[PDB]
Amino acid sequence: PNIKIFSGSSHQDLSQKIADRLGLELGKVVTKKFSNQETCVEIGESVRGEDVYIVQSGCGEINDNLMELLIMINACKIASASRVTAVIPCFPYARQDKKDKSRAPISAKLVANMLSVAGADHIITMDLHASQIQGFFDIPVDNLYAEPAVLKWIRENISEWRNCTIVSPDAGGAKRVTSIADRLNVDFALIHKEDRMVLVGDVKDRVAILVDDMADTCGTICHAADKLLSAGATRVYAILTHGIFSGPAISRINNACFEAVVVTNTIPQEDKMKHCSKIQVIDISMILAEAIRRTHNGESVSYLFSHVP
Amino acid sequence: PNIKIFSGSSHQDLSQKIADRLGLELGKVVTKKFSNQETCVEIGESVRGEDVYIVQSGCGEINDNLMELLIMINACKIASASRVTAVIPCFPYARQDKKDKSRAPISAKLVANMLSVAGADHIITMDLHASQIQGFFDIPVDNLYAEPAVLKWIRENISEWRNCTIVSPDAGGAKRVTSIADRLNVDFALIHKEDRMVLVGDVKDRVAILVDDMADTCGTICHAADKLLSAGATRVYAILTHGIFSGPAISRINNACFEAVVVTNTIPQEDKMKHCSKIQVIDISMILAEAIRRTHNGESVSYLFSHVP
Amino acid sequence: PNIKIFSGSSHQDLSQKIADRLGLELGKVVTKKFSNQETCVEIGESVRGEDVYIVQSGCGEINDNLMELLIMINACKIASASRVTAVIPCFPYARQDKKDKSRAPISAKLVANMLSVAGADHIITMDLHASQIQGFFDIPVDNLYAEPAVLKWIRENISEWRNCTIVSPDAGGAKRVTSIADRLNVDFALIHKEDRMVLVGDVKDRVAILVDDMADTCGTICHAADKLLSAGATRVYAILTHGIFSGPAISRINNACFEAVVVTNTIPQEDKMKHCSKIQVIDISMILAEAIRRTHNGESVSYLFSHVP
Amino acid sequence: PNIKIFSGSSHQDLSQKIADRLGLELGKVVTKKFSNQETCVEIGESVRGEDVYIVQSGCGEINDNLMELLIMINACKIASASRVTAVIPCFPYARQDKKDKSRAPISAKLVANMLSVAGADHIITMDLHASQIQGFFDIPVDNLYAEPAVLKWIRENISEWRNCTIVSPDAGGAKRVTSIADRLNVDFALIHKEDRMVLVGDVKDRVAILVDDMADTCGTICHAADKLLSAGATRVYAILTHGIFSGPAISRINNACFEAVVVTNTIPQEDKMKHCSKIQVIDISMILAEAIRRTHNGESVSYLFSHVP
Amino acid sequence: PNIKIFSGSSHQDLSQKIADRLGLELGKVVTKKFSNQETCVEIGESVRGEDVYIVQSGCGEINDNLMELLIMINACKIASASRVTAVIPCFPYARQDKKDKSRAPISAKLVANMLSVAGADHIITMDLHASQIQGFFDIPVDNLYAEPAVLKWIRENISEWRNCTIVSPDAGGAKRVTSIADRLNVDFALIHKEDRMVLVGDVKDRVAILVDDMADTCGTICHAADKLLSAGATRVYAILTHGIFSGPAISRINNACFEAVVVTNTIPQEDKMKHCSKIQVIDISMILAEAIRRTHNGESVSYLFSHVP
Amino acid sequence: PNIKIFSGSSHQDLSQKIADRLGLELGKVVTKKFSNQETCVEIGESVRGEDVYIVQSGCGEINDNLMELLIMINACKIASASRVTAVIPCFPYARQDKKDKSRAPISAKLVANMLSVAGADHIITMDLHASQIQGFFDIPVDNLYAEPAVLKWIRENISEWRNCTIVSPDAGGAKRVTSIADRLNVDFALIHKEDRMVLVGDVKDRVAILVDDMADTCGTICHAADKLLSAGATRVYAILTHGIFSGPAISRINNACFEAVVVTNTIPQEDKMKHCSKIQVIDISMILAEAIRRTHNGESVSYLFSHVP
Lengths: 309, 309, 309, 309, 309, 309
What we know:
Organism of A, B, C, D, E, F: Homo sapiens
Number of strands of chain A: 14
PDB class: transferase
Distance between the termini of chain A: 24 Å
Radius of gyration of chain A: 20 Å
Structural class of chain A: alpha/beta
Largest sheet of chain A: 7 strands, mixed
Oligomer: part of a larger assembly
Keywords: phosphoribosyl pyrophosphate synthetase, phosphate activator, transferase
Chains A, B, C, D, E, F: Ribose-phosphate pyrophosphokinase 1
Number of domains of chain A: 2
Strand order of the largest sheet of chain A: 10-9-8-11-12-13-14
Entry title: Human PRPS1 with Phosphate; Filament Interface
Helix content of chain A: 25-40%
Largest interface: A-B, 47 and 47 residues
């Protein structure tokens, strides 16, 4: 059983980078739309008794990409692939992980069920919005962390990183920032809204680094950055693993005080970089490639939680 | 347990017509998109211990509508609805019902599995592309027929209907046309391609009526109509239950010789009627409403296979 | 994991031919009936961590054979076989693939569900009545084609095959005949009933070849052959992949004008050949053996759709 | 939701008796065989939102009857019956309830799985060979007892019943006989083979009553009766809930010393009574009818374990 | 894929013995309780693509041990183990294998379902209370037998074993004793209660050996031993595969006439041996180790039904 | 370990045919000459832990091709290929298999030694000039036979093959012709030179078929054909497995009386067919492909000695 890497249409550059790091050519697949907008998928090579990895992120036209992924999984499964793994760098509907006093769907659970019923045997993803989403599956889920790469970027790009403060934009992300604050041996601050925001932790004359899983409309991080500049911070950075940047995010970032907005490339960023000078990208394709290769060879994946490969 | 009718965004006029025929107000639901294009659904009323019917056709932005339907089904199911029924007038991915010497998905089966796993207890649909799709489910599926309404339209709109010929555009649909030919006591002709088409059955000086389940790009029916005019037909009609009309269909129909292109309203047609004079619509909302009401009251649904209500 | 081939009682000659082509001895199994007619199965060898293939066709005493197959699958699965494959040359209840305005079962779907619940991981079959039956499963199904062998037989047995006409007995099978007509570069004709039959396509002074998936009572092909002789055909052949020949089929064929009735050996034919001189058999055991060997070795099975091994 | 009773072809007299006791007409169903021996089923009336009971015993052509039952269950389930119950007076493959140092199937578990996957919601049966078969299901199973009726027959037919000895033919059935011995306040004896049999318990000058679940070939009960006459018994009776009587059973009973062989009518007995004078039948249709009516009305079924209705 | 053996807290000595016989070190796992008595499990080594065997018997604090086993199975399954096997020497809730005229659970079936849903692919157990419990699973179950070891113990410890009588304490276990009686070529006796017990079979001046699957409170075997001494037996032994010895069992055995009470070590016995001199233990770790090694290597397990390794 | 097929420059068409039959792309290799005519080889893909097959025949510039093959074998072996197989359809220096009263080399043995020392683990060849060359190796050698294909060609191309005579050109090849004569049930004749030739066996009015391993200069077969026409033969064919056709062979064949000169394609023939009308080619790429696939999968190769795949 050999590795076969197939790309969905969502993020073809990432799939190519992963394939090069694996020393493979991207599997031959045709993924387009019929005239009536139904997703047309044709696997261009035999996947029999192979270990198939399908790379597709929850970005762009999310429902189209999700249906493409499900259809590709189904095609590979009924084509007698030995094992089918969904490599989903940004998990779609991850923020709909609970109901919370609303007659709402748990869309993340529905997506997990659909992936399972399509025939996925394994999920590889990066920085799930809530790690409880792992429990939405009955198949194994490897939730990788961009932190090795975020810490690397911070050390090699922020000269004052030893005196910086890692800041959570909200009470929800505090855990994450504390983890980073522990690995850098720096202070960590929290910010919560009461339209006013309250900040705990000295940030005067120090570089502040907001950290988060995802920036969609960037209202949260822009308000946090305004508050950080109010409290005497020298420069404010924002580091996010998922740069969705939908709606007015680009205009708000352009009007914000960020020195840089660093995001990983779980979502393609070339178009946003054109219209926003201060967006920067951290490659995490090495982490994804190493996770694929370790799942294939039966080596430890959790080794990657703390080690940059 | 009362009837609750909810509309997806795909076909709101049809849902309203069904609700009026049932004497009900469309259930309160908010169905929109978040900024990052994730489907947001909020059920605006309690559906506890109710018999819920969600109307959504496989039309327009098909993957968006399908995800909306699945999310709404899930929301109603975890909101403790007694029973959830998907009313899908045009079934999405119905034409992907087999592999046939290709490493292709069976997308119709995947859609059926997704509907089942979302929590659908029952499916109501009209003129499935292949009735074998009924076997793709383990829940009951009521496949209604537009034929009572097509026959009604033919009798009240084609003055020469007793001397007409019902024509299949291809060998696949012959069964359907024979059924119609049996109910009208008229001749039936077949047309098959060898770029040339061959026609069996006298059509000279007689009105010809092409009959089909769906017109997507209308290449099939336009070629058939050209052949029918070649063979001395007086006028050529086309009657389809599903008027998808994607791609170049409107231009081809405008350049074709059809007297009329009659389609049912399983798919909204107002925009296409603006740009195509010869499109006409047969209301099938009475059949759908009667099917809903009979499933709710435990009356016979198959009664509708031969009776216009 | 090695190949183990087990024979049901339905078609032992075919199982032996397959085993010889694989270079194996048929797995030791006792398959008989208790006094009260319950199916007794005993696997006479260990199948642990083996790739098990059970050969059983839907022929003869169909319900007995189907229960035998399910019981054997269950016995191998709880005996810790690594993988269990059902090799079903003629799929039982394949013609009950839809309801169609009747309160009828979808028996083909029920059979698929029973095979899955017995523990089948994979299905190998030949010329499914409707390829949509593939969607009745969630496990992979390889639907082989007898066409490579039918084309071979036509070329080596009909001297006038370049000027012949391939004829469908009904509108349903037209696809199949067109495929054959494409591979031979000959004309193709259709025949449909209006008790009268209508034929499209010149057949005068030409050899006609009716083609079909199955001959049960042979009313269809006998009526078609009578019509073909009415239309001036020189000789009429019939080629079917499944020769069920139940009821009055043998008498009708004996009284018909067929030059030959060629069937594959998916169903044993020795008894019918005794009472019908014009039945001939095309061996497809090479296709089945190659499919088994390719599924075992992870080679391409679809290679066989166009290549005689 | 109303009661609909449908009969399989196995035991139509029992189904009619049950229908009369319920005050209903047997549901309209056509259950025959196609020419090629495939089971043809057509439900002749709507079963929508009804409580459907299908009566079929594991007797006669067992695999044919079992397939008929599964097909009928499937037809009713996809016809949108509110609930489907299988009334199986004699459960097929019940004696294959374990492996026991053999590479054998657990056929009873396979049958249970097939019934569940066909869509049965509930099982009603009488005197399961092993009550552990109840655990083979995940749906509720009501295992009725013929004992109220056996005790009634014993009291009204054996004048010396107060001085009789209830005898188990083997060590396996002892529980059953003890139950009966407790309800009659009589002695109970056991018989076990060491070709020789050993009997414990005084039987001289006393009427002996062998009791068992089923007589298939009647070797067991005939050997037991020979031993009982050897030990000075006055008359020997045999009472069995299931009179299968396959193979040489009728000849052995005719040559045996039984005063009577009483069986229930879970299996039709008219043909056997023709060739065997000493077979007598205890009607249990009242127990089955009361169980059906109590499951329908939500009354206690276990009330019937001790009360003759 | 390598063997990984993990121990639950129930029987660590047995797990160590098995690990030594396999030439392996027990897998690193932490299995303790949090303060609030929730089971805490941490797998201390990677189990990716490994063949995992978790040893846990149904003994001691049964519900705690069962939950520990389920949690460990789940942890290994979501840690991407290739296969997870539960090695359960004494199966918990095995005696709750049926309802029998009681509104009782079938707890054995519930345990089987829980093991399956936790992710067990395979079960290895010894002397199931009823072999029908095998049918409660859909995964393969290997039910080993202590009989090779019981027969070995009898021959090497009872000098008069050729003239002994094997005795069943009740009618239920007779099968077992007959098996033993067949393998030793000795007489077999039965004992059943009518507070009085009746014994069939000469036992005077002969050594009697009661045989059973399990001794919980030992009322059954103590009453049987009293009866055997009443009937002139010289010495009475008791041999049980599962020595649960709960409640007053130790006091009753101490006051009983047994020469020895031999049990296997499916349940730890050191504490009971302290307070009961006549308890002796037969090691069955060789049978369990050989079964593990044969399932891993794909060799025949049933070979062990008759051969001591 | 996967199959990797690499082509030398000698016979690229054959390598491509083999690769297509295996469903593979020819391995990437650069095989050219430096300016000073040293053979330059570069393996363009990783062959680590792969099963490598290098196809190179002893044809054309024989010493260049042999050195290319040795260099490619060495490159693959020091690149850590798991196994390296030389597929040599025509074995070079095969005719130098002995000394025979001459101070000559045994060049075939030298070639075998060089292949072994380069690192070949296995040899696949067709119709070795002397099968004793197999003993020149210590590695396994599979010597395939073109006979299945020669017999096939004879039956499908020579209408009088049942009355033909198979003729050996010399006493050395008699064995071969007898084999063929046995498989066709025809007469076999020998021809030996005393410049005169003597023929044993009636050939008058019968088609004669000279059979041989190789035609280099074709003096032997041309003299034999002249003698056969002298002895009253009707037509003379020549069938050779290796068509070397060096020196004056083409002119002699053009001036000879052969109806056809059939050779296999172990050596490329396109150039010779241009200048010689009566040369015909029998494809043996199926035999070579099947041998490669069977050696890879561990199936029987000798199965091919008598079976055309």
